[PDB]
Amino acid sequence: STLKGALSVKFDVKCPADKFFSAFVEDTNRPFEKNGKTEIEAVDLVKKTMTIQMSGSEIQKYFKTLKGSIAVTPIGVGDGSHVVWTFHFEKVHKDIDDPHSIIDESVKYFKKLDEAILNF
Numbered sequence: 001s002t003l004k005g006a007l008s009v010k011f012d013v014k015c016p017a018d019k020f021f022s023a024f025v026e027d028t029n030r031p032f033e034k035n036g037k038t039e040i041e042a043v044d045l046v047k048k049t050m051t052i053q054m055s056g057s058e059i060q061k062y063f064k065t066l067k068g069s070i071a072v073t074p075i076g077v078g079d080g081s082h083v084v085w086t087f088h089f090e091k092v093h094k095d096i097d098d099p100h101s102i103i104d105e106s107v108k109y110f111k112k113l114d115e116a117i118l119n120f
Contacts, residue, residue, distance in 0.1 A: 002094045004065075008086040009103050013114040017072040017081040021048035023117055024070065024110075033058045041067065048072040051088075063099075065090030068106070083110060 013020055022045070028038050035057040042051040051069040059066060067088040074081040085106055087099050 003092075004090050005098065006086050006088045007099050007103055008084055009107060010082060010084040011107060011110070012075065012080055013072075013083050013110065014080045015114055015118050016078060017048050017074045017083075019117055020081060020083065020114065021045070021050070021070070021072045024113060025050060027113070028052060031056065042069075059102075062091060062096045063087075063089045064092050085110070 025043065025045075028040075031038060032054060033056040036059075037053075037055045039053040040050065041053055043049070049069070049071045051067055054066050054068055065088075067086075069086045069088060070083065072081055072083050085103065087103060087106075089099065
């Protein structure tokens with residue numbers, strides 16, 4: 001299938017995973033664009049894992065199918081944690097670019113979600 005695929009980035013966050021995941025899960029109540037639509041397809045508040053459906057007249061100009069799955073993992077003891085993110089997608093047509101910009105920005109969104117918790 002020349003349309004399906006995914007892109008997953010793994011990076012580190014300064015604060016413990018327990019507050020990181022919960023804070024992210026809560027912020028998904030706010031859409032990610034004007035006509036944004038998110039939907040919880042899977043979630044586990046113990047292991048800190050969640051899959052979400054995300055659509056909107058904008059992000060839909062490229063992906064007819066886009067899901068974002070997060071998985072957070074504490075590093076040490078109160079020393080930060082890992083945070084892998086994915087966009088299990090299905091583009092409208094094969095010429096659409098893989099979501100390298102949508103995920104680099106997701107990472108930006110996460111680097112800030114870490115600074116806001118850490119200092120608040």
